[PDB]
Amino acid sequence: VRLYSCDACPHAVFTTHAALLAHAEEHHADLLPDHARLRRIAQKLNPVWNRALNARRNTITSWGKKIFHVAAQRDAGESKMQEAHRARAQLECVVRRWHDKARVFIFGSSVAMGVWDGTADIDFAVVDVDAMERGSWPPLEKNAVRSITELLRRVGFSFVNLEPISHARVPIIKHHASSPDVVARSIRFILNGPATREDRLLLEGSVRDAVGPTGVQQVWWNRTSDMMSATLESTTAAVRAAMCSPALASASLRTKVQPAHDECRPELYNIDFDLSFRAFGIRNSTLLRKYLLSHPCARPGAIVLKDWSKTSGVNNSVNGYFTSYAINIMWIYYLVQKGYVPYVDPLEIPESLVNYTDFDPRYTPMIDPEITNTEREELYKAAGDMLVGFFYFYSFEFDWGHNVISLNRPGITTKRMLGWHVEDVRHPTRYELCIEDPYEENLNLGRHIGVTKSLRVRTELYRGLLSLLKECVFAA
Numbered sequence: 346v347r348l349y350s351c352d353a354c355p356h357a358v359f360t361t362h363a364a365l366l367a368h369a370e371e372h373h374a375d376l377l378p379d380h381a382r383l384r385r386i387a388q389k390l391n392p393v394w395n396r397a398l399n400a401r402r403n404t405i406t407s408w409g410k411k412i413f414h415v416a417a418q419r420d421a422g423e424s425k426m427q428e429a430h431r432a433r434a435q436l437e438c439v440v441r442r443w444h445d446k447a448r449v450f451i452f453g454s455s456v457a458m459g460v461w462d463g464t465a466d467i468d469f470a471v472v473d474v475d476a477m478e479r480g481s482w483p484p485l486e487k488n489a490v491r492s493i494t495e496l497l498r499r500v501g502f503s504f505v506n507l508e509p510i511s512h513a514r515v516p517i518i519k520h521h522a523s524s525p526d527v528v529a530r531s532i533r534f535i536l537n538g539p540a541t542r543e544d545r546l547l548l549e550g551s552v553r554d555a556v557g558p559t560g561v562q563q564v565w566w567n568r569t570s571d572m573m574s575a576t577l578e579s580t581t582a583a584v585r586a587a588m589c590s591p592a593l594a595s596a597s598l599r600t601k602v603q604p605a606h607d608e609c610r611p612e613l614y615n616i617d618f619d620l621s622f623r624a625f626g627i628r629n630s631t632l633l634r635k636y637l638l639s640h641p642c643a644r645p646g647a648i649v650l651k652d653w654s655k656t657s658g659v660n661n662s663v664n665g666y667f668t669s670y671a672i673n674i675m676w677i678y679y680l681v682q683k684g685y686v687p688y689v690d691p692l693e694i695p696e697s698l699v700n701y702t703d704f705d706p707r708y709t710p711m712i713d714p715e716i717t718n719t720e721r722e723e724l725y726k727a728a729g730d731m732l733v734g735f736f737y738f739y740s741f742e743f744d745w746g747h748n749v750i751s752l753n754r755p756g757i758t759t760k761r762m763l764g765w766h767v768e769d770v771r772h773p774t775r776y777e778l779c780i781e782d783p784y785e786e787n788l789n790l791g792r793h794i795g796v797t798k799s800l801r802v803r804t805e806l807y808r809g810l811l812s813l814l815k816e817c818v819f820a821a
């Protein structure tokens with residue numbers, strides 16, 4: 346026996362879950378206006394589910410073709426992925442001036458999905474692995490954010506584009522790219538006075554020493570010897586050169602440097618990114634990647650569910666709903682429980698980054714370019730079946746009342762196993778809809794979802810189920 350409290354009025358407490366749910370429909374139908382109606386429609390289909398699947402087989406396959414089309418738009422090919430690789434190397438040049446042993450790791454969807462569309466935000470983690478192993482990483486993050494912001498400003502990033510967030514719970518730097526080849530790999534040094542011949546040789550020397558023997562293609566000076574331009578062999582060499590620290594002979598002679606062009610610039614200037622100093626996101630993305638590569642329909646379904654979850658409002662963490670990570674866990678848990686992918690213990694992905702190699706995320710095409718028309722048709726059929734099955738599983742099979750969506754063990758996790766069978770009751774930690782975070786113990790990804798919010802979520806799962814049986818929440 347326990348207390349249950351309403352999340353939509355401050356006074357309603359009950360001693361049974363049934364009474365709580367009844368209260369939510371009876372007093373708060375304005376908050377969940379389609380719940381009872383869509384539940385009733387989907388409940389008509391349940392006793393005839395196999396018949397429905399059979400009759401709607403062509404439609405379900407058509408939805409699989411659409412799923413693969415949406416997924417294909419996220420796959421911009423290996424060359425586009427390599428643009429993110431170059432940006433990462435560019436950023437690493439910059440951050441090593443702050444901390445020589447820091448290295449830059451990409452995480453997020455380019456890791457989890459093995460593709461990048463050239464537009465999705467890139468996450469960069471900056472970590473000194475030796476220090477992390479000693480238990481001394483990150484250094485004070487507010488100061489790290491300010492230090493790296495200044496280095497970026499000095500290599501040509503504008504305050505228009507850079508947003509230091511030194512005081513968030515996790516301090517980060519956000520870079521917001523503006524919307525609009527030799528020029529892109531060229532830079533300009535402006536000097537505060539004229540350089541002597543010795544000074545010119547020293548500056549050129551500094552550039553050459555930064556990039557190595559093949560890095561410099563052309564160097565030239567203006568008539569007044571107060572600007573030097575340089576074309577480097579690549580955009581990455583161009584950033585490496587702009588990070589040099591000249592030691593000129595003439596007293597008080599100083600340089601400033603930026604790309605030779607205001608819009609045509611190295612990759613790092615052109616992409617949206619969040620820069621952070623912690624390792625946890627790397628591990629999360631690597632766990633997702635292992636699961637999502639293990640069935641050919643797993644990434645396409647994950648992509649369609651991310652978009653669905655945002656459009657339907659169930660993925661909206663700022664207002665207490667789920668995150669994109671939570672939605673991926675829902676999808677993967679379904680895949681594991683239904684036997685579409687093998688179980689992976691989150692503990693199989695090391696916390697330590699000592700053996701890490703994939704700083705640059707490995708590219709895997711969304712669909713095998715060599716499969717046959719027949720095989721492709723079979724993938725469409727499977728993708729549709731799997732997606733309909735996800736909405737059916739969460740609408741009728743999964744026990745939201747007593748169990749937890751969890752990848753931390755292969756079998757069923759009950760709320761009681763995690764101590765989530767009772768709430769401390771306001772804004773309580775809620776255990777209505779439970780999804781266990783793989784690496785943070787005792788964290789419910791549904792902790793802000795009280796009863797009325799949970800019925801909004803259930804509404805959308807019924808709506809998704811019904812929509813995939815018909816000719817839109819899934820519209821681009």
Ligand SMILES: [Cl-]
Pocket residue numbers: 662668669670
């Ligand atoms: Cl999110």
Ligand SMILES: [Zn+2]
Pocket residue numbers: 351352353354355357368372373
């Ligand atoms: Zn209420």
